[PDB]
Amino acid sequence: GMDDLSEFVDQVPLLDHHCHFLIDGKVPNRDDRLAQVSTEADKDYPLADTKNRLAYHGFLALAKEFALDANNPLAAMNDPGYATYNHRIFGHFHFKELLIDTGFVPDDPILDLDQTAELVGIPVKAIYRLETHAEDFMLEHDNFAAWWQAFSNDVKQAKAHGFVGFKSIAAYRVGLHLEPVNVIEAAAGFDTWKHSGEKRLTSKPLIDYMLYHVAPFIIAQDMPLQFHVGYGDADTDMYLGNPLLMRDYLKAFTKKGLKVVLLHCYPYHREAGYLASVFPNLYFDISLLDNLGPSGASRVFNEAVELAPYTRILFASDASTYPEMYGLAARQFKQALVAHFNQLPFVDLAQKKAWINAICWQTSAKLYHQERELRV
Amino acid sequence: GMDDLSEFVDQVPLLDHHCHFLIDGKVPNRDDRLAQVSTEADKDYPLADTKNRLAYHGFLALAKEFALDANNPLAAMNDPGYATYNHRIFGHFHFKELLIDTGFVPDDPILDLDQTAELVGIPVKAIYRLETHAEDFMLEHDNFAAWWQAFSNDVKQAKAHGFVGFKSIAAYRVGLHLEPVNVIEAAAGFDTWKHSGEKRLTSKPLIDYMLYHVAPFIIAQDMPLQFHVGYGDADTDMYLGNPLLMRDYLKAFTKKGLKVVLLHCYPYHREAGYLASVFPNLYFDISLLDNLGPSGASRVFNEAVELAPYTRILFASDASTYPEMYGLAARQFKQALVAHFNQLPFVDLAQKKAWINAICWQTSAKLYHQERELRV
Amino acid sequence: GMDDLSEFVDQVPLLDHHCHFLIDGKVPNRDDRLAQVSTEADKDYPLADTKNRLAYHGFLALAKEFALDANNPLAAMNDPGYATYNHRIFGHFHFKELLIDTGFVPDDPILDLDQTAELVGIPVKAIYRLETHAEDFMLEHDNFAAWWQAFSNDVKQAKAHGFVGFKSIAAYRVGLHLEPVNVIEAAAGFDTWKHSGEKRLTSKPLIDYMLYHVAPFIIAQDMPLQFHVGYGDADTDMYLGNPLLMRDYLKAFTKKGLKVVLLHCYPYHREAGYLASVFPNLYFDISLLDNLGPSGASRVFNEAVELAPYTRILFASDASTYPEMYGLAARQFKQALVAHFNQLPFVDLAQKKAWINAICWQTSAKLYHQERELRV
């Protein structure tokens, strides 16, 4: 029937399965940095226009709500104050763990995960970004075979090195129409890349080869593989970000045990939820939409779960830089859950609570093997 | 103004213009069969995940509500009990006729239409599935010309043989980007098919040839041609299921009198409704979504009719196997109609009722020539 | 918090930045003309089906509400009555200026802009349709070079000749996947066009050449370039109307100062709003949807602004022919604004009012240099 889940959802812990480094709290232009991170627009896009989106105003609202000094709510913060401030936000929303994709580095970063864990008050683990590791290995080798040996060995060693999952940014570089590639074309892609002088990996033949060939390595370590899907920057071709384009890859590997996680998804969240309903081992979130498109979080959540199992959708923030972005994601997502489940037909209160727990922390705890961190 | 159409919609009859065979009520694993039919996932997909979708819970709710034995609500049923149970569900929702696409055969089927009509208490007629008839004729002929003569004669005889319409499953096999094909390519497709040893018709050249060439035969019999659109299984390429891809076929035949019905449509229901607004003789439904994505039925209905004429959208369940799937479709669709029409601006109560009648039974009665069965 | 903006929105002026000529009020078949303009269906589409869409009923409701003679609400009108009637509708909704794309000519038009301004009681300015000017110049020249010189000079002179912006109908002719074209291919397109005997410009190579080459001319005059996006007639390929397909053109010119306005957008309004969030100088509206899909205006507005800046979305009607179509657009859009902003989080009442003003008139006043006309 009709329930009131607000108080329950207030206390539900969050395992943020995909997010990003924070920056140094002492950085002076905090208001502008908040504005800049509130959008995927680039540095040339007018800041005044960014400030006329709702996300920025959500960030300001949270800054005011949790401010150390109500009279100087946008002040830079020294280390004790910044830790206090982070603790207030992460604690308010009951975040219990962050899994950080360490391949994105914001300006003035806090890179150390132990320092991040001290700052926010909860455990923080790393996700291995494939393409950035591929780039760094490229610089050390002049031929495909030696590069591939070194890179693939690094991928195979990720679990041993303390990573808890993997990430591909293919959608930002080449799109998601993943198809198998012969080693001839992959190696030609490598050579073209090497000779171009550009560090950035943008070769579709080489990225697609890499993704097909690392899948067994990832399955053997039994850790998830995340993909960015949808919502990107002006250099992302969003037309190629429709996750239906991944069907051949999903057919190839999900039945073999590859756990694939579709990040963000918007505007293709119905497609992602559909895919979750027909493929094994396929999970998704509405991160980035949930904080940077805050008025859409409830309707997007609802649309996202029309066909999906509730045990396949995950909480993530996709947040970087400042705790407001984490907080806003949490607030909008938790509001969406209450609005969705309060009037949901057919199921009892206990089932509603079981599904909310799954989405917020429990599915990710299982998927990423983080059960211990989520113990009460 | 603001009306309350609940009581009116409760009594409105339904002509289910596209649905599927039921199974033997004596089958022992009824709970699991209900779960399995509640999704388009295949037998290898984890049943526990399917059971964590809302559709399964809707089916269980209806099973409990209408149960023969409240203490054993999921029991298999002998023939008198099963007829009683079917009568309770079909009667509650005021189903008055089923048009069954006889080309899908669930395991342990009830294939006889007279037996089905006795079971459910209302008339049941057949829809002629093109591709399955094409397959069965293929087995009897070693060359295209003899196959085409035999198959086309069968299509021409469908009305005489008691079928009330036609169906294409092209979307599941080859997609919906229908383009004309020369007989050379069609016959080469036939030969490749014949030589492959695979019974399943998957040749795009041959399917597209077939669809262009049977259109005049169907027009001459003045019966509708249904197409699956959108929501399919993991082997369906949903990217090719966008009905905008059908525009050349629609331009070719709708003006000639071909009555085309777009089944399911989701996630392309706005596209289908748009098409209904600019092509003659083009109808659609939100079947399969309405029962298997039950939380989406109201918003999907609303989105579907933003541009469509209300006289072009139809009720269907797309239900098979068990009466719960029929009932859930009816319940969610009837709820959508009340929610939509109660507050709809500009039109009077009488117009609201006229449109509800059109959608639920009257348009399909006209389209399929079933006026007699829908008499009060 | 929760505001009540109804009274505020009632008084907000509208700058209708994209709309179309009215027709002679004396035309006898006014009811049928209202029906015919209420849809993008063509003259062969059954009028009875058009009359079973909600838009027609909205038009009738407004006709009754504002009727000169309550007893003959659908009567043709002589000139004084027609001016009175237009004044009632435009005045009720607080229209303050119309910018008319003069490249669409309805049957029995009022073509004179001064006469239109007298009829409606507000200033009326012209938008220069590229393709129709291109067609008219084609008739006067037998070779590409002389045609291009004449046409490009006309484009360069548009501001001097009193036009206030430009419009491309590329979406209706060739779609929106704009790519650069060599002069060889453009000139071959011109020759094929010239030799075909068809006046209508349909050559993709020539249209795309034209659009890339006129951009600098338009930037130099600092006036906007409008594109039809999405919702078109049965001869429009809506599949090619996805504005994500424009990304290379937007990357080429927005940073150079080209002000691009995406008209209508539906069903790709989320895509348009996304684009507004990551490109400079990129604006959009939900015109045509707002009046011809009147039940969708609120949800479409909401979806449209999930990511966009509120300072990038504009009011337009896309209305032609009769004042009811203008009025219905205004009514549905103003209702959408109240529903959206009343409960919008994070921002204060003043910010809500600032954004409403931006959308209704102020952004367009700036963009089109019409500040003087919007003075109170």
Ligand SMILES: [Zn+2]
């Ligand atoms: Zn991402």
Ligand SMILES: [Zn+2]
């Ligand atoms: Zn990310």
Ligand SMILES: [Zn+2]
């Ligand atoms: Zn189907």
Ligand SMILES: [Zn+2]
């Ligand atoms: Zn079916």
Ligand SMILES: [Zn+2]
């Ligand atoms: Zn237009």
Ligand SMILES: [Zn+2]
């Ligand atoms: Zn227009």
